DNA sequence: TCACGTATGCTATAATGTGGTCTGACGCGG
DNA sequence: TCCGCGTCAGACTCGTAATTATAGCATACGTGAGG
RNA sequence: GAGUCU
């Protein structure tokens, strides 16, 4: 059942809902994204290959020559990413693309076949991915945040009361294009319809009508239905349908063929409607004052003169009833108007609207948006052609059309990027229909508006602003240039398509530093979803509603992941079983329910289909592959939870984890803590540091070996087989016959990364976690990260904590910890440190590297070498010189004073300063790298010589075990086929090996695999030189630097800083803490056994906070460590194999009804021991987030430990030795050393440098700047009275020039006397205004 | 200026005062080349327009953008709104003789007492040590003084020890929402790094221990020591001035 | 009302220094006003004694 | 209405007479020969060329009306030197100086620290050589690859390429919204900190006290050398304008001064310990 | 909200129980970044004027 | 009177009107 | 009634430092050194 | 731009 690595140590898990759908891999967005980017897609263009297909082939303004795309290719990287991160250059690949000049002849019409010319052409470098989802930039690895922006398309929107003073809803259409104009549909308070293009003046709606050639007439037979009026003798009658006459009040007495309906001044309710409809009534005789006030729909002309009785959109009345009665005219066309039902808008709007025909609208449209300039019928016809009805200028994209067309409720899904007449007047009309009543508005908070960008995309769209910067010069070159000599390489230019797609890579908000500091941090950063950015939102712009959390979000955006910044609701982590969908939208696995029966066909429903169907909870019983037990299933459907009967039940959600993100699900006993401290404590966990020593946690959920795995920060075994080869830096393992390649040896090498600097300056180590000759299964955890243990995440360690107050040490979430925690190195961190040394070129002359620099002691030039560079391996301190760099001087005027003194020693200041790299100012610890750049053609030290000798024989050596483990596992092979056909084992393993290759055997399908060996084994033997040239070339290889500098010297010092008053510390509930005094192990509080506790937290910080799952944490912590005890004591006493079987064996079936099940019959006697080896410590035991372990099931498991019911234990007082009034809560909670560390904290400055124009101090402890005075503090001495203490703040502690330098001397004497003056930032401000043109002047006494 | 390396740096001044020059020496050319009137009004508009961009950048029309596509800084914009000079240097400054560092507990401490670290306290006080190092007759010159502190000999820090006593600091944290929130106490020197709170006065500061970081100021002037212990000590400070009730209330 | 009655004073330095910069230093140089520096803002700005 | 610069000046060149052959002969043939009325409407007719050539030359120095205010200096100098008598036509003879005006005169205004002709014709040869070496050495060139194209020197193409480095803006943030600049962070070196400027004061007011401490003729020898008290630093040869006039006893009299200054640092506590200094 | 939550912290909140209660608990976390803002301006024209 | 960096000058096919972001809010004038 | 302009808490830590494109050659203009 | 205290 279980694997391996599995064996070592068995999580023992608590859940009971059997994971049908396993933790899919959560690095899968950002691989997947720019996987599509640069995979050449054939014909589905998607990345790199839409790029090109877009912009090109591109011609010219002649039109007769034009550049033409085949096809691009990636070329392999110049420096991989070892070398990448070492050197500090980009990780891209060379993009090759083949692109062809063909030219058309001016005298035929398309006289194609004239010149194809042909080159594949460099354009820019590529950032290339790395296999954990990063992109190294100038050597640090960062990672591209996915963009969460509103989705493209029709979306309908409405003010509700921030328009205007009455309060109308004057509701809106947005048709959001991917490219393009916008196209704005608005109502006004008077409910006249209005279009605008990018937000700019109102036009009528009517505008954009007659622009795609509507009539008055037309606009009418859209919008509005048609009343028929027949005049007949004298009488007037109206076509009647029965439904129109609906909730309204009888204007006149409707009677039909002769009956009375309904009277004067009545209501007609549905009855009048059915009674009318019922009876079939079809013509109805009416007055003829009811149609003034109607609307005729088309035009009436006279019959006998030939003239306009009446224009289309005029309101009728009796005068004009007679006049088309006597012309000949006795059947009228009319609008029908109702006032709730169907609205009057385009009508009314056709009256404001001042434009006439089509040419008319055109012009208007086109004075808006160019305003000034005179209008023509082609600058007219054609900028409305180029605003949305381009190929060009407008695309909607595969997304725009397909939420376009399912917003309009239209049959088509895909169709075309350009807005259609149709399309324009579907959304008027839908836009009405809202207003009339039928349709409501979609809200953006919804994720179904909401559409994920992710890295490949973002690409894509800056590599297209590459290839429309070479648009332009391509068009200019081509008409300018002659036709014979013009290759297309001329025309191109790499640079903007390399700057815009680097200004992507590297200035763009969301391209960042990776925070790499805990392996969950570099997982659940690449999983982040930012709606910040270009195309999408500010803080600026940011409201409330976008901000909280949505319905939608269940199971694709956990609700408890977000800073606590202004960014609250913006940035979010992406939820554990989330994917991107097809489209772009967010989509949540569901497992189907057909029958009632629960199908383990899972559907990935998206934001939009997920509102339709009815989903039972995770919490509802199954009855093993029956269905639901319980007749009354817990449901949610239509963005609302109720409960519901089994049959209406059609789906149900696949996992109890699916609504939190990943370092949420990572918390235990989430269900018991409140939101807002689950946020800080998932976001804490994140900050956690790794630790000297990788503690695993008692108290997991069981995700820990997912996030640890998935991170990539885990060596894993590619192909499973036995260890050939241990190190503490590689690992060599060979792989089993039925996994393992026919073609290669088949030995797996894996060279640890081994103790390396982070982006946060901590530690990255890969210790390997497999012994020597141990057989391994295939996606097994070969060696162990900086914040891993045997596959599971290790982001702190866990300890005793007894809940208790103590002396007020434990105020205020203040933390008491024993010296043995301290002592034992254990929360101890390393900080691996990067200091630069750069010769650069003054104007004097070109900065050396030696030894011999003016003014120093021999204090400072011992630990340095012959060169002047640090031994590797040597302590330093503050002061203490790293790196000895001189730099020239002018013959700078000595004082007189300075030249007696210099003569008075006569050690005189030569011509060339100083300004060595030094150890930064109390940061200390030991050198462990120094690795040298020198620039190609400048003088090398003695130093860097040795370095090149260092790496250039390791190189030597290390290629030469690849050739070495790749020949032995090579011809072991072929022995072995040898001896299938001509069996001479010990005779043939006597002489050389040399000579084996020749030997063959009878022509079979063996014989074939003989031939792939040894001409393998050549391949691999010539590419043994051309590989060993290649590393010998790069070390031989000057490195091109930046423009001044000579070379660098990049020193790695390493850091050992163990825990101390005022570093923060935190548990994973969101309980935080500083460390306020390290009590010895003497004074700490002990159980009647006798052992002392870690560490004593507050009781008081608990209720308060409403986090409990930290006290379900400790109380399970403290059973685990029970069982890990009990095993502790029955491995030192010897017992029995059979006995550690039996004990083990009823704690892992201990639970009620557990989920996992290990039968240990099936475990070997050598298995079960080095379990129990492990288990010794505690048994590690996993609480999933909602399916976690009750109370009981702790309880019981206290009981296996022989440790209370309650997990409270009589403490007693190490200081005096009797005991607390009371039993205290003791256990162990898994706590976590945050990067808040008191040594970097710490600040303070008296005097230093002054800023340029203010003359106040600097800022931060970066610069060494003092400490700000805000107008807040100032109000503080204000309001005290103490205008001394404020005045010595404002003048001689800031600005006053004079004041500052006279004060301290002051001070020095004795004196401490205020002598001020006036701030010289007052003074820039005199000159400031007077630069405006403005007397300012101080008028005086 | 200079930035360290090659490269330079300049103020967004230089770069409208240059547009102003520029189109004023072109006018008075195109005036002595007595050029058509329509040549003439297109530099009288542009002289106009790099003008209003000097003075105020964004108020008459589109703001001038540089090379980083945000507008050049206007010299209006150094005098107005929050980072003019008024409220970010000139109502409020950076101050000498002050440090931070996160806060702890310090239950045996009095209430007119703080922990003082060593090392902040040493670079805080310095030109107070070094006027008493010449008092004792230890350090000749100011620059022998600086060597003597930097070595940290151990003559150093008994006279540092000599100093603070009866010598208040002040202890400040953010937000500064009311005068309670700065408070002068007597420095006790400690081991450490980090400063040790009065756990009483924590209600005036809103000041928890999950790792605050509070401000330290050191009043120089006589004048300062004396405001410092008489208006600002913790001791004399027990009522809250909103309400007559005392702040200092044990939690 | 606070933000009227702020800019009502006669300091012109208590005005620039609360809002509205652009506004009161053009009235107050057409004015040809005179700030005697009265209030605990202008002697903050100068760097008096309060 | 419209009150843009731009769009207003394009209105009024729009309304005016694009001339024709002979029409451009006949004003011309006044025009050097000097007239009023020509050479206006030659300059006012041939404002519409100036427009498209600027607009091609853009987004690389100034903004636009720039370019067209400098191409119009050269549209005039044009109509100054054309050749009516030559059968060749107006708009191929200006295209050569609007061109050139704009080019010529972009290089210029475009950088902050002025940067000359020449310095800036050698970079931009450095620069078309590096496209070319670049879509064959797909990455970009280095300054030797672009060095040992030309066969010139190494230093030279460093030199020419260090000053195309653009200048950074102090007034540009670093944090984004509203955190800190460049000005926030840069220190003003050339006013030293109380701390540097009380040492001086210290040092220079210790020197006042030591020279009053040593013998009468060796302090004044001594001190109007170095121009400590004096009013010009002198040298051992020029003391003898004083009352010393002596080459050989100035010299054994400023040593002797030295060495007795010497055993008083040694035993005040400097000597070696402020030799480090 | 219509539907308040029955459970306890002692014995649990559920899926949907701990999806309510994120409503209320990023509403007040937002309230603690931004509305602030529109508190301490008070402050500042509180102080202005007196 | 040259040496050296800097500046001004002229090129004659014809060519003659320009082309980044798209969403805040609540108050208070003109 | 609509457009325009004005406000929008207080400190702290880190981190990095980008791009474009301007032809080519002959006399003219200024300062400093050497004969 | 990512954080820390409110
Ligand atoms: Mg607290
Ligand atoms: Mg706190």
Known sequence: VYSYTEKKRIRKDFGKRPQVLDVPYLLSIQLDSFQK???????????????????????????????????????????????????????????????????????????????????????????????????????????????????????????????????????????????????????????????????????????????????????????????????????????????????????????????????????????????????????????????????????????????????????????????????????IETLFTNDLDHGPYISETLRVDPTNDRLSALVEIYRMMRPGEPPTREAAESLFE??????????????????????????????????????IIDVMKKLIDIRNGKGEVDDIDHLGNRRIRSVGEMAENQFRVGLVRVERAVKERLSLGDLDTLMPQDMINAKPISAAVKEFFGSSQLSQFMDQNNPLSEITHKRRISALGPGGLTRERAGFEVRDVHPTHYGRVCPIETPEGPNIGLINSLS????????????TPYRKVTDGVVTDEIHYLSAIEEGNYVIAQANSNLDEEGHFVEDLVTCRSKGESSLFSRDQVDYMDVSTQQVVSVGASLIPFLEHDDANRALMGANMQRQAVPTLRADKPLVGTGMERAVAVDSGVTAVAKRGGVVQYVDASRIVIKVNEDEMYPGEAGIDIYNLTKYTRSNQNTCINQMPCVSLGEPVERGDVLADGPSTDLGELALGQNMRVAFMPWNGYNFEDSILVSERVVQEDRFTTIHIQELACVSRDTKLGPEEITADIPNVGEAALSKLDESGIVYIGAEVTGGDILVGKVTPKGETQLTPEEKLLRAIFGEKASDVKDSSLRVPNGVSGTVIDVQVFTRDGVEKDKRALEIEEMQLKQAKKDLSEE????????????????????????????????????????????????????????????????????????????????????????????????????????????????????????????????????????????????????????????????????????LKQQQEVAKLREFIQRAYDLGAD???????????????????????????????????????????????????????????????????????????????????????????????????????????????????????????????????????????????????????????????????????????????????????????? | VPLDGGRFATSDLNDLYRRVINRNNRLKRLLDLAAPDIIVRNEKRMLQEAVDALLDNGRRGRAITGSNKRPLKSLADMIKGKQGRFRQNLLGKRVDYSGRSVITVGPYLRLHQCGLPKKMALELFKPFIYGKLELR???????????????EEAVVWDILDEVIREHPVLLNRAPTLHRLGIQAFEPVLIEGKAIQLHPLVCAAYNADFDGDQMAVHVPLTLEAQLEARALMMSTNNILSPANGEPIIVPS | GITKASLATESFISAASFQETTRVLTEAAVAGKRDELRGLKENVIVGRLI | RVLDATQLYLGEIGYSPLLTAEEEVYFARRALRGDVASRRRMIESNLRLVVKIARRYGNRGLALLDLIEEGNLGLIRAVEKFDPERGFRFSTYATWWIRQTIERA??????????????????????????????????????????????????????????????????????????????????????????????????????????????????????????????????????????????????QIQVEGLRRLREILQTQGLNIEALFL | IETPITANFREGLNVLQYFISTHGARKGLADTALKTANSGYLTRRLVDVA
């Not at chain 1, 005991?1219 to 990067?1235: A, C, D, H, I, S």
Request: with cysteine.
């Open chain 1, 37 to 331: 980017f640069i995979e050449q897609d054939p014909e589905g263009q998607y990345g790199l290959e839409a790029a090109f297909r877009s912009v090109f082939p591109i011609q010219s303004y002649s039109g007769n020559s034009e550049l033409q795309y085949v096809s691009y290719r990636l070329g392999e990287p110049v420096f991989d990413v070892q070398e990448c991160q070492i050197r500090g250059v980009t990780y891209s690949a060379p993009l090759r693309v083949k692109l062809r000049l063909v030219i058309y002849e001016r005298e035929a019409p398309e006289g194609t076949v004239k010149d194809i010319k042909e080159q594949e052409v460099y354009m820019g470098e590529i950032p290339l991915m790395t296999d954990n989802g990063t992109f190294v930039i100038n050597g640090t690895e960062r990672v591209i945040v996915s963009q969460l922006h509103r989705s493209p398309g029709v979306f309908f929107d409405s003010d509700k009361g921030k328009t205007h003073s009455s309060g109308k809803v004057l509701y809106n259409a947005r048709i959001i294009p991917y490219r393009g104009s916008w196209l704005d549909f608005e109502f006004d308070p008077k409910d006249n319809l209005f279009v605008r293009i990018d937000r700019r003046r109102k036009l009528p709606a009517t505008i954009i009508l007659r622009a795609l050639n509507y009539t008055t007439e037309q606009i009418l037979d859209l919008f509005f239905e048609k009343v028929i009026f027949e005049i007949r003798d004298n009488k007037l009658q109206m076509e009647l349908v029965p439904e129109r006459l609906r909730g309204e009040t009888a204007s006149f007495d409707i009677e039909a063929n002769g009956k009375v309906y309904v009277e004067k001044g009545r209501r007609i309710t549905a009855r009048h409607i059915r009674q009318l409809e019922k009876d079939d009534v079809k013509l109805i005789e009416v007055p003829v004052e009811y149609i003034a006030g109607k609307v005729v729909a088309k035009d009436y002309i006279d019959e006998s003169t030939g003239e306009l009785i009446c224009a289309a959109n005029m309101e009728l009345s009796l005068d004009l009833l007679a006049k088309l009665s006597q012309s000949g005219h006795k059947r």
């Open chain 1, 386 to 423: 180029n605003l949305f009805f381009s190929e060009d200028r407008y695309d909607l994209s595969a997304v725009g059309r397909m939420k376009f067309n399912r917003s309009l409720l239209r049959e088509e899904i895909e169709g075309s990027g350009i807005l259609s007449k149709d399309d």
């Open chain 1, 576 to 587: 554990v079983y989330a994917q991107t969908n097809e489209y772009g939208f967010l989509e």
């Open chain 1, 963 to 1130: 050739l070495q483990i790749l020949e032995a596992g090579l011809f072991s092979r072929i022995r072995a086929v040898l001896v299938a056909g001509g069996v001479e084992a010990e005779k043939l393993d006597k002489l050389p090996r040399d000579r084996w290759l020749e030997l063959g055997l009878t022509d079979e399908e063996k014989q074939n695999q003989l031939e792939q060996l040894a001409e393998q084994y050549d391949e691999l033997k010539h590419e043994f030189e051309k590989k060993l040239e290649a590393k010998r070339r790069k070390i031989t290889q000057g490195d091109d630097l930046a423009p001044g500098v000579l070379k660098i010297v990049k020193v790695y010092l390493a850091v050992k800083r163990r825990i101390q008053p005022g570093d923060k510390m935190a548990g994973r509930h969101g309980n935080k803490g500083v460390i306020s005094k390290i009590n010895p192990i003497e004074d700490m509080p002990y159980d009647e056994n006798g052992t002392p506790v870690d560490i004593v937290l507050n009781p008081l910080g608990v209720p308060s906070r409403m986090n409990i799952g930290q006290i379900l944490e400790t109380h399970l912590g403290m059973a685990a460590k029970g069982i890990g005890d009990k095993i502790n004591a029955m």
């Open chain 1, 1154 to 1341: 557990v989920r996992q099940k290990v039968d240990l019959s099936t475990f070997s006697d050598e298995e079960v021991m080095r379990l129990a080896e492990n288990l010794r410590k505690g048994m590690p035991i996993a609480t999933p987030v909602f399916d976690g372990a009750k109370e009981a099931e702790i309880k019981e498991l206290l009981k296996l430990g022989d440790l209370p019911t309650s997990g409270q234990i009589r403490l007693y007082d190490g200081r005096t030795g009797e005991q607390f009034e009371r039993p205290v809560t003791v256990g162990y909670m898994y706590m976590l050393k945050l990067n808040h560390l008191v040594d970097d904290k710490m600040h303070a400055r008296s005097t230093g440098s002054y800023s340029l124009v203010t003359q106040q101090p600097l800022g931060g402890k970066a610069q060494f700047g003092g400490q700000r005075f805000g107008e807040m503090e100032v109000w503080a001495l204000e309001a005290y009275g103490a205008a001394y203490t404020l005045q010595e703040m404002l003048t001689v502690k800031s600005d006053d020039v004079n004041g500052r330098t006279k004060m301290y001397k002051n001070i020095v004497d004795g004196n401490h006397q205020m002598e001020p003056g006036m701030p010289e930032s007052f003074n820039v401000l005199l000159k400031e205004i007077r630069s405006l043109g403005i007397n300012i002047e101080l008028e005086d006494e």
């Open chain 2, 137 to 151: 007759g230890l350090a000749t010159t100011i620059k022998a003084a600086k060597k003597m502190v930097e070595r």
């Open chain 4, 106 to 251: 972009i290089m210029n205004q475009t950088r902050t620290i002025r940067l000359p002709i020449h310095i800036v014709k050698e970079l931009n040869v450095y620069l078309r050589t590096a496209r070319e070496l670049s879509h064959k050495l797909d990455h970009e060139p280095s300054a030797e690859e672009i060095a040992e194209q030309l066969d010139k020197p190494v230093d030279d193409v460093s030199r020419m390429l260090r000053l195309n480095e653009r200048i950074t803006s102090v007034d540009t943030p670093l944090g984004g919204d509203s955190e800190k600049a460049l000005l926030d962070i840069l220190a003003d070196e050339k006013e030293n900190g109380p701390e540097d400027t009380t040492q001086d004061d210290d040092m220079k007011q210790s020197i006042v006290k030591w020279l009053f401490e040593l013998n009468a003729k060796q302090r004044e020898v001594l001190a109007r050398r170095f121009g400590l008290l004096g009013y010009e630093a002198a040298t051992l040869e020029d003391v003898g304008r004083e009352i010393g006039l002596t080459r050989e006893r100035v010299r």
